Each structure stands twice: as structure tokens, then as C-alpha cells.
């Protein structure tokens, strides 16, 4: 806002600019894959596969 100086400020709050910026989220980022038996055989292999995806 412009510098507002003085005791009396009549009709000086009005007229100020409020500007906006736009964001488009769009579509999700997917990682679509298949889970095989070796991945699910134990916790560590599953964690390795999910870690590779993430």
C-alpha cells in the first residue's frame, strides 16, 4: 500500500489492490505396478519394493 501519512485519512483504506496467484493441482502422480510373490514373502522385501516405488 502507498505510504499513508497524516492525522486524517478519509477514503484511504479503499482503493488498495489485492492480487492473487493461481495454482492448478492437476492430476495425481501415480506409481501403478504389480506386487509379486517374492515382494510379499516377508517384510523386508515388501519394504524394499515400496521404497523403490516411493
Amino acid at each position: 500500500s502507498p505510504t499513508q501519512e497524516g492525522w486524517d485519512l478519509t477514503d484511504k483504506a479503499t482503493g488498495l489492490l489485492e492480487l492473487n496467484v493461481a495454482v492448478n493441482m492437476g492430476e495425481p502422480d501415480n506409481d501403478f505396478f504389480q506386487l509379486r510373490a517374492d515382494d510379499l514373502r516377508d517384510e523386508t522385501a515388501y519394504r524394499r519394493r515400496i521404497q523403490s516405488a516411493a
Binding site: 505396478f33 517374492d38 514373502r41 523403490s52
Partner: protein, 53 residues
């Protein structure tokens, strides 16, 4: 002055301690165990998965 059980126990213990001490590089590399468990067929050509891209 050694009986058979003590022979086996001391031998296994000494092998484990000595191998695990003087091998620093083999300990840094990842250890893999394959589910195949083959029997005296040179195992197999174990095909190991690699990370997907």
C-alpha cells in the same frame, strides 16, 4: 584331552570368530539368501531381481 563334542564346538567357534574378524570387506556387502536351497548341483544360476525403473 579333547572329546568329540568339544572338538566340534571349539572348531566351529574358532572358525566363526576368525572369519568374522579378518574379513572387513565381506561384511560391508549386502547378504543375500536365495529361497532355492539347491543340493550339490552347483546350486543354480540364481536369477536375482534388480530395482525397477
Amino acid at each position: 584331552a579333547l572329546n568329540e563334542g568339544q572338538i566340534v564346538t571349539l572348531a566351529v567357534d574358532e572358525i566363526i570368530e576368525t572369519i568374522s574378524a579378518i574379513t572387513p570387506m565381506a561384511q560391508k556387502a549386502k547378504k543375500y539368501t536365495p529361497p532355492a536351497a539347491s543340493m550339490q548341483r552347483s546350486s543354480n544360476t540364481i536369477w536375482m531381481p534388480v530395482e525397477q525403473e
